[PDB]
């Protein structure tokens, strides 16, 4: 989310504005993203390594 404009850009901003129906992407689950859209249960685990 661009902070002052409060617009979502990218794959989530495509899911927010109704252009796309689903995203199967390397899209990490984040609290700022969870407020605006839905997520499935995660399918793959990753951490700082």
């Amino acid at each position: 989310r661009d902070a002052d404009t409060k617009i979502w850009n990218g794959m989530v901003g495509e899911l927010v504005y109704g252009k796309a129906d689903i995203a199967i992407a390397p899209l990490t689950i984040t609290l700022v993203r969870e407020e605006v859209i839905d997520f499935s249960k995660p399918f793959m685990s990753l951490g700082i390594s």
């Binding site: 495509e14 899911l15 252009k19 796309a20 129906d21 995203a23 199967i24 992407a25 390397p26």
Partner: peptide, 10 residues
């Protein structure tokens, strides 16, 4: 048709 949006990354 269900729209899949993805980003290009290997």
């Amino acid at each position: 048709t269900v729209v899949v949006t993805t980003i290009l990354e290997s």
